[PDB]
Design a protein around this ligand. Structure first.
Ligand SMILES: [Zn+2]
Lengths: 105, 105
């Protein structure tokens, strides 16, 4: 509700394309290759990937498990995507406690 | 925020999903009934829907029988999302309109 940036935030793709893993002992890096662009994401060693090689990711789609930064998602996808994310994530907490609450509120 | 008029005349809407992208199985699975009811019950249809030989007209409030009929159609693979009016797309200043809010729970 305060739109704060999570400490252990996930990493999302700013552009859409095909992923390219380069796992090595030195570091782990994730490459998003497109028709004319190629972006590099340097994940830490303790990164729980949810995307494998040969997958088609879109802008705003997460590449690692964790909580998405609302401000980063707003710039990548748009106002409609961040509103959908906020309503769904808030309802997850209230469902776990068995509380029924309409989406309108 | 106060309900200040009957209709704002807008044409924007939101689409309420009926399926969820399960990650462990990498597939689309039907959402729970309580989650579907929490986002559809007592809401005004933005567009006309035709499922299971029944015509639901635009501008119709969704009763709990209508929500259950929609879930039945989803199980038969006839509909994936429902277009409804929401406060997120209302154009009333300083509040919402009657059609964008829905029913008094
Ligand atoms: Zn309205």
């Amino acid at each position: 509700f305060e739109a704060r940036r999570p400490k252990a935030k996930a990493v999302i793709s700013e552009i859409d394309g095909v992923v390219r893993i380069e796992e090595t002992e030195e570091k782990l890096s994730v490459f998003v290759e497109s028709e004319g662009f190629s972006k590099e994401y340097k994940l830490p060693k303790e990164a729980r990937l949810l995307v494998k090689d040969g997958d088609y990711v879109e802008a705003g789609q997460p590449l690692t498990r964790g909580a998405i930064d609302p401000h980063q998602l707003l710039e990548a996808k748009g106002p409609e995507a961040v509103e959908r994310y906020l309503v769904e994530e808030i309802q997850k907490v209230y469902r776990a406690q068995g509380v029924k609450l309409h989406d309108k509120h | 925020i106060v309900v200040r008029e009957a209709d704002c005349g807008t044409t924007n809407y939101i689409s309420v999903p009926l399926f969820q992208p399960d990650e462990v199985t990498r597939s689309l699975r039907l959402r729970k009934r309580a989650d579907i009811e929490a986002g559809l019950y007592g809401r005004v249809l933005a567009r006309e829907v035709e499922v299971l030989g029944v015509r639901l007209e635009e501008g119709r409030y969704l009763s709990m029988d209508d929500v259950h009929l929609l879930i039945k159609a989803a199980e038969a693979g006839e509909i994936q999302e429902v277009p409804v009016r929401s406060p997120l797309t209302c154009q009333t200043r300083y509040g919402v309109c009657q059609k964008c809010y829905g029913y008094d729970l």
